[PDB]
Swiss-Prot record, chain A:
Residues making up the signal peptide according to the UniProt record: none
PROSITE patterns given in the database record: RIBOSOMAL_L7AE (PS01082)
Protein name per Swiss-Prot or TrEMBL: Large ribosomal subunit protein eL8A
Presence of keyword Lyase: no
Lineage of origin: Eukaryota, Fungi, Dikarya, Ascomycota, Saccharomycotina
Additional comment: Present with 238000 molecules/cell in log phase SD medium. There are 2 genes for eL8 in yeast.
From Swiss-Prot, chain B:
GO biological process, one term: cytoplasmic translation
Name assigned to this protein: Large ribosomal subunit protein eL34A
High-level lineage: Eukaryota, Fungi, Dikarya, Ascomycota, Saccharomycotina
Protein's UniProt keywords contain tRNA processing: no
Part of the whole protein covered: 58 to 113 of 121
Keyword Transmembrane: no
Curated annotation (Swiss-Prot), chain C:
PANTHER family: 60S RIBOSOMAL PROTEIN L23A
InterPro entries named in the record: Nucleotide-bd_a/b_plait_sf (IPR012677), Ribosomal_uL23-like (IPR013025), Ribosomal_uL23/eL15/eS24_sf (IPR012678), Ribosomal_uL23_CS (IPR001014), Ribosomal_uL23_N (IPR005633)
Protein name in the entry: Large ribosomal subunit protein uL23
Keyword annotations of the record: Cytoplasm, Isopeptide bond, Ribonucleoprotein, Ribosomal protein, RNA-binding, rRNA-binding, Ubl conjugation
GO molecular function, one term: structural constituent of ribosome
Pfam families assigned: Ribosomal_L23, Ribosomal_L23eN
Taxonomic source organism: Saccharomyces cerevisiae (strain ATCC 204508 / S288c)
Gene designation: RPL25
Family statement: Belongs to the universal ribosomal protein uL23 family.
UniProtKB/Swiss-Prot annotation, chain D:
Assembly behavior: Component of the large ribosomal subunit (LSU). Mature yeast ribosomes consist of a small (40S) and a large (60S) subunit. The 40S small subunit contains 1 molecule of ribosomal RNA (18S rRNA) and 33 different proteins (encoded by 57 genes). The large 60S subunit contains 3 rRNA molecules (25S, 5.8S and 5S rRNA) and 46 different proteins (encoded by 81 genes).
Name assigned to this protein: Large ribosomal subunit protein uL2A
Any GO molecular function: RNA binding
InterPro entries on file: NA-bd_OB-fold, Rib_uL2_dom2, Ribosomal_uL2, Ribosomal_uL2_C, Ribosomal_uL2_CS, Ribosomal_uL2_dom3, Ribosomal_uL2_RNA-bd_dom, Translation_prot_SH3-like_sf
GO cellular component labels: cytosol; cytosolic large ribosomal subunit
Modified residue annotations for Phosphoserine: 51, 94, 158-159, 248
Claim: Ribosomal protein is one of the keywords in the record: yes
Taxonomic path: Eukaryota, Fungi, Dikarya, Ascomycota, Saccharomycotina
Swiss-Prot/TrEMBL GO biological process terms: cytoplasmic translation; maintenance of translational fidelity; ribosomal large subunit biogenesis
Record key words, sorted: Cytoplasm, Isopeptide bond, Phosphoprotein, Ribonucleoprotein, Ribosomal protein, RNA-binding, rRNA-binding, Ubl conjugation
Gene expressing this chain: RPL2A
RNA sequence: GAUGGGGAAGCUCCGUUUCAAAGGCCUGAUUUUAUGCAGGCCACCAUCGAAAGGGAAUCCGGUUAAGAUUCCGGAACCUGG
RNA sequence: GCUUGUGACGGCCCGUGAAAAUCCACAGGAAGGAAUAGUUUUCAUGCCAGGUCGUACUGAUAACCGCAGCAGGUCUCCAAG
RNA sequence: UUUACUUAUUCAAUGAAGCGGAGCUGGAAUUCAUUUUCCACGUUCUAGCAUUCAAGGUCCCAUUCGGGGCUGAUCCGGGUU
């Protein structure tokens, strides 16, 4: 009790060599870190065209899981099960003599940008899931455009890695259904209606809206000072 | 010679006093004097300036 | 959530797990035999008149050794071949591009009775 | 012809600088954080001669504000600075010779030397012996400072540029005639090899524009244009007038 | 004079700390034990470049046809372990 | 007295007359420690090893360079009455 | 012709350390209810010293030999300036 004293040091300008702090702001990251950080900085200081800014607007958290409970039931068949059906299907050929019609219709989530574009052109789609994270954006900029002109409802949803595991891949960049079991139209119908009010119905407004253009904290604060100073009268 | 200060015992390379083998006898005395007077002057400035602010 | 605390203004390369090599097969499938043997370090003696005078006088053995040898190999080789102890080794590359060794035995051994044991005297 | 002596200087083969005994890069202290809001006290350890220049240099020692370290600075000594002095470097540092203060935070009419002309250069104009700067007038908004250079030039630089108050030591170094060729030999043994100088008129036409002819003469005008090329620019570059300086500066 | 890079059709030129994630030492922990794992410290920075610069330490006597501060006898010192 | 080393000074400079490896010291208090016993290898003594290449000779009115055994050229140390 | 912005491009600095905004305490202001500010908000007789995740306060642990969290040292924005 009495042997311990109280030092407290004075960390100001001239004494008390400074304490260790968090200089995470003051770290010179590798060039690859800076280029990707300034990749999105530069993309929001520029006037992004109006055919884009359809993206950066995504199905919300509440309706993400509900949209993804339906797609997750109809997961495309894995390799292990596919090995099981074929040896069963071949066996059914041996004595059942069925014309490769042993198993019923497959129900799985469709995908593939060359596949889905054909499905959209043939009116064989009723809900399209689209990832917003395509590094080449030109692969999808027409996908919201095809869906409206044909009349298909689409949902630009966050994440390829999450559209990937739905397909048992790493990325899919697209996902859809074209024919569903008789017990899921009740879930599908109202799910389609929700995305209409977000992506389909609002499309003819977003066709004329630009994005980005936002400034940095030090520059947004500057106009705040400039406007309020000039606001005095 | 500088390399030969490795094979020589410790009593040949330093003197007993603080800062022994490095500083002068009178220079060590000088910083002994200087340290005391202004570590006592600081606690004089410390009490003097707290009196001026306390009056106001 | 909150990030990790980084007290430095620098960021360095993290230490990764560096595995070893044992790829699939040997580099040469036969390790080489001993290149510099005890029989290759020492070729032959010098029996010149100057060299022979050294033998009886200074308990020194004069040998013609490999150009690739050093004094550790010469000391070990003399011990193996002749069962004698070397006190010191002196080397000189002769003006004909060959190495000569002055091998001095301990007082336990006499080079006179060893030189004729080899067969030169 | 042949390329001429002022053309051969840019190859930098034998016309480099002699830098074996030059002490270091005599710069100012860095503007990290402890001067822009406060100050930091420093000590002068020794003032030494610099080979190549005629102004002494000071060894100013500061404590590291971020490590248990004693980082030392190489300043150009102000006339009046002495070993053992205390040096204050900051924004609120007093107006005393030896202190390092910004131009925007010193009163008009101040004598300052070793003055940056962009904040953070660690040293710029008024470096030579007996040279200084004076502040003429501040422009507080869009912060600027109006100062006069040793050449007599008025230059506006950022208000937060720095400078040591006072004048460089060693003034009047040139009032003494060298009296001797070999005295100029030692002045330029440690500066550079720009001495001695054969005249260009005492040359051969292959070696110089001015060479040749039965008498030693220029032949054409020695006043040369700006647009002249390397090889033609020997003489009085870009001269507006010439002759003998009659009148004032008329600037 | 490499490197990271930047030019140059190109043989090659610039440039030596430069718009590099650039490197390694002490002590622990287990004594299935290799060093994974406890940790902290370090920010300079390839290398080559002087038998007259800098630099750890050997002296005397004797000895050969021809070698010796190197052999022999004696007497030392230095570095590393 | 000659030659050479060394010391304390003086004159001189708009000339003020290298760099690193390496070696030591100091400040600081991490840790480790004592009683039937601990600690220091900056004290002394005692043990082992010290690799590679060079080393002969001339060094010049004959061994180098000058077509050569050339009145030329070629850096330096010691210096008796 | 003048003029405005920052992310492109151009220039300079540091091991990219204290940038921007706001907030806790106020020397000097008229508040005409309820606060608007320049900004104040650890160092200047003196050639000493300032380093060990910082001592202190506090909450836990499984006591120990000590260990950890917060604060001491305002928060937010990741724009190095």
């Amino acid at each position: 009790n009495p042997l311990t004293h109280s030092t407290p040091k004075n960390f100001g300008i001239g004494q008390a060599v400074q304490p260790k702090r968090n200089l995470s702001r003051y770290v010179k990251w590798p060039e690859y870190v800076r280029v990707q950080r300034q990749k999105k900085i530069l993309s929001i200081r520029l006037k992004v065209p109006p055919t884009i800014a359809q993206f950066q607007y995504t199905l919300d958290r509440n309706t993400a899981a509900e949209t993804f409970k339906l797609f997750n039931k109809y997961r495309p068949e894995t390799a292990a099960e596919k090995k099981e059906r074929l040896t069963k299907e071949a066996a059914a050929v041996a004595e059942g003599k069925s014309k490769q019609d042993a198993s019923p219709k497959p129900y799985a989530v469709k995908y593939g940008l060359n596949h889905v574009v054909a499905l959209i052109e043939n009116k064989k789609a009723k809900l399209v899931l689209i990832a917003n994270d395509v590094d080449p954006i030109e692969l999808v900029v027409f996908l919201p455009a095809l869906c409206k002109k044909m009349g298909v409802p689409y949902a630009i949803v966050k994440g390829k890695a999450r559209l990937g595991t739905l397909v048992n891949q790493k990325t899919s960049a697209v996902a859809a259904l074209t024919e569903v079991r008789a017990e899921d139209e009740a879930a599908l119908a109202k799910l389609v209606s929700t995305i209409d009010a977000n992506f389909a119905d609002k499309y003819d407004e977003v066709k004329k809206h630009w994005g980005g253009g936002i400034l940095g904290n030090k520059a947004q604060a500057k106009m705040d000072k400039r406007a309020k100073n000039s606001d005095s009268a | 010679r500088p390399r030969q200060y490795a094979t020589v015992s410790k009593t040949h390379k330093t003197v007993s006093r603080a800062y022994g083998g490095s500083r002068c006898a009178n220079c060590v005395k000088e910083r002994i004097i200087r340290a005391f007077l202004i570590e006592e002057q600081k606690i004089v400035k410390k009490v003097v300036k707290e009196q001026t602010e306390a009056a106001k | 959530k909150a990030l990790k605390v980084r007290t430095s203004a620098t960021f360095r390369l993290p230490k990764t797990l560096k595995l070893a090599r044992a790829p699939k097969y040997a580099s040469k499938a036969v390790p080489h035999y001993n290149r510099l043997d005890s029989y290759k370090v020492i070729e032959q003696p010098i029996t010149s008149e100057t060299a022979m005078k050294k033998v009886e006088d200074g308990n020194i053995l004069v040998f013609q050794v490999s150009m690739k040898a050093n004094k550790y190999q010469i000391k070990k080789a003399v011990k193996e071949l002749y069962e004698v102890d070397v006190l010191k080794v002196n080397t000189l590359v002769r003006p004909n591009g060959t190495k000569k060794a002055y091998v001095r035995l301990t007082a336990d051994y006499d080079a006179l009775d060893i030189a004729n044991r080899i067969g030169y005297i | 012809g042949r390329v001429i002596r002022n053309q051969r200087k840019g190859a930098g083969s034998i016309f480099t600088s002699h830098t074996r005994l030059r002490q270091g890069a005599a710069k100012l202290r860095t503007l990290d954080y402890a001067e822009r809001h406060g100050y930091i006290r420093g000590i002068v350890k020794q003032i030494v001669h610099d080979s190549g220049r005629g102004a002494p240099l000071a060894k100013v020692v500061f404590r590291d504000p971020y490590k248990y370290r004693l980082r030392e600075e190489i300043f150009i000594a102000n006339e009046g600075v002495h070993t053992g002095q205390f040096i204050y470097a900051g924004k609120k540092a007093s107006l005393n010779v030896g202190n390092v203060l910004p131009l925007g935070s010193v009163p008009e009419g101040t004598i300052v030397s070793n003055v940056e002309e962009k904040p953070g250069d660690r040293g710029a104009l008024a470096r030579a012996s007996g040279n200084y700067v004076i502040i003429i007038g501040h422009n507080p908004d869009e912060n600027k400072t109006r100062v006069r250079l040793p050449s007599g030039a008025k230059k506006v630089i950022s208000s937060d540029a720095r400078g040591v108050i006072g004048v460089i030591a060693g003034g009047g170094r040139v009032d003494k005639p060298l009296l001797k060729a070999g005295r100029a030999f030692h002045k330029y043994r440690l500066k550079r090899n720009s001495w001695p100088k054969t005249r260009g008129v005492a040359m051969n036409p292959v070696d110089h524009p001015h060479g040749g002819g039965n008498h030693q003469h220029i032949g054409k005008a020695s006043t040369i244009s700006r647009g002249a090329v390397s090889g033609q620019k020997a003489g009085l570059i870009a001269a507006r007038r010439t002759g003998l300086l009659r009148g004032s500066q008329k600037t």
